[PDB]
Amino acid sequence: TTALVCDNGSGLVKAGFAGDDAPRAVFPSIVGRPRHQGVMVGMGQKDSYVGDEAQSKRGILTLKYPIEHGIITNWDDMEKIWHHTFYNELRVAPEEHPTLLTEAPLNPKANREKMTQIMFETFNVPAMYVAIQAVLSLYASGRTTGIVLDSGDGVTHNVPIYEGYALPHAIMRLDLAGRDLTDYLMKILTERGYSFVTTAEREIVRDIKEKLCYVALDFENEMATAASSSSLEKSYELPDGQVITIGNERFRCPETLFQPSFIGMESAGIHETTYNSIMKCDIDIRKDLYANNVMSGGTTMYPGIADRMQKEITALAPSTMKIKIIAPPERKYSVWIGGSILASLSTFQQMWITKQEYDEAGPSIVHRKCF
Template structure:
């Protein structure tokens, strides 16, 4: 089953984290998210008079429709249409709203009515209108009710013409009027002057209102809205959790933006405060994704004891098998040793030719090979017996090389071969002895340095501590740079990776080497100097692990000395403490854990926690783009700058009246903190000590529809309607001007 907020599995799975008071958001299963709001009531049994207008708030995200004498829309549907043929039922299926994404087939054929916030899909819009009129109880071949439709700021004439053609041609509408959604929302305030900020789904519009009319020539538009904010949230989450076990979808990102994001009153201070892990954890919101709880096969104590005994029995059998193999190997070695000694003793009785034939039959080329085999078996048998008795291996004895000093003239062919082998053995033995001597000399040198350093510490403690601190910082810098370079090499676009590729390209610039070079032929001489091998070290980084180990050892030694002898050096200055401070910030960023005992630790084995996202910085960063579009790479002024520019264009008296009616509406205006943030942004840019008022409706998503419904009850609505006769006479692009429409020119 899938744990959801209402399921028992969710309650049980969340019990392990019940000690925390962090806010939680539960992502519903993708097959049911988001749940489409049902129609308020069927309208088939409630016929309305033909004078009652139909109100359609035709947004790019959702369509809200209802009757003009209602206080709320009859239904709300997402602007998605899916039309496809079901092969199982052999029928054409038409779905509208979020139901268009209920399965893979419908989702694959779904499309939106809009391209951004411009109406382009006439066929899809026709399906949406079919659904609208059907749910309003209109079954006749023509729509006798007047229709009021909302549109975006500066709607292209072609988009409005498509809508008019649909309404008048396909539905035989009686009359239609258009208006800007954000202005209809402002009309509910009752003010004659103000500034409307419409935070729509695909864009944000800023429209000044003077004398109860929207001034379209002074209006401005920001190409950032709810859709772009949702996409930014999706990208931030994907970058933050690249190995998340399930795919985060666009509807889920929309859910996170609506439920978790807020406008910070002072964004810079907010971000700086997140340097404290506890502050970041305090702002953290946990997002729990649905997951399938595995069925646990609980075993009884008797079964567990039986399985443990079975494992012990298997271990005993394995030990016996290994003991048997060692015994068989020892018996074989003893048998081989007896046969080899028999061949060795035969040298005293056999002739030289017969003895050589005996050696060759046994697989030896000479008597020296036989002696080496005998010696090897003896050493192996000795080690095996000592291992069984638990004794340590004997120290290496100095070998004898009797033939090295004998001239070749005094040796036969077999002895010369043996002399070459002894030279190789002696070279290896000498190398081991030199290494041992170098280690002893190095130990003596280090002892001497420690003694000298001890004298320096006793004679001048302050200078000694300063030198140790310098070495400590230099070592930390080397370790940090090495780790930074290692991380940079993982990014093929980084400067380090590019430099590495240039080195490889320079090495391969002359083409591949020939398969076979003649002796003394085309040799480029590469590798004869240390600089050549430095290139290989730069490419392969072969010594980094050894250097890292040496630096870590030196770092521990330096920190131990400073902690013991420097009173100003504390544990918080150690490399581990510094790393933990940085790691605690990363942990708070990724897991919402500030390190306090009251918070549950992240458990990699927990299935529930592996399906959790933590939103902290993203909660204020995503909405901040409205005020700082450069955060998302948008080359545009923010809302605060646009509002300042619009105010500067108006006269002082007009601006003073407009400042008292700054109104924020639209779906994204429902995010918390928008009024406080806009107030803090405008206070420094408006005239000193000038009064202004920023307000927002209680339900920004429905306020435009309610404003349209209220305006449709006025006489002005009747004058703004375009009749079917006027449509046929003047064309689909014909419009009538009114206060809240797109048509004011002054």
């Protein structure tokens, strides 16, 4: 009695069979529709494109994401994707295989409830389970207890976990991502003496961030040194036809995660927030949580972020603690992997949700059953 794992990401969709250790089918979750009327005339009496079919036609077409992190607002597009995943990608029948679905942290009551109903009434699967993306990531690292920061191509969250059990009532959402960082990056460049007011320049700033941004061991020490000298300056030539320069900007951009005050947020930096989440956690797992801090997703990929996290937590630490930061090599696909191992374990078998249980208790049962 194996199950299918469908991971709904913030930019990519991962599908596979239970007991498999690597995804064999990955594709973005996008809907292709014409940008404007001129595109529509040449469409050829057809509506839209779904899946890999629209992937190579992306520039011309408007791509809409069924998932906003976050929250699924377009149900009609989302349905097409699941169909495409099970049929065109997986090439298996949903009725003969159970389905494992992922959910965004703090998922709305209407949104979580509608999805489960579709799986049984529409697809008519024998049994399906819904799990948290952050929870899955911890399993992949092989750690049952820990805290995982999940940043994908949409949203970033801090979720504490014990022996596979999470605390949804204690999950905080971070709205700070690379795009926000880029606007800050432009602000710092302007102070330096480089003007990036035009739209073309802003795109260039984005490229600069992606390839020329890293984080230093001590921000206050490094920022002042970079601000008063040209020792850390770098220059990059883009294929478009012009040359731009970046200096203190390279480490200042990622800094805002640690110090939100630079962008203008009421909430305190990520390093303190991680601390608050662990403090609110179970008494015998805190020791494990500090030594099991794991970051997941493409956005948090920036090298040295783990080292930078280590620097602030140790300096700002109280007294009865030790700080170690973990950054697994497979962190990009950590979320999918945890579900796979979890589904292959005996302990998780009792935690599955069936059709009969669903009808009587509703999708709400997820808070009581799902950790």
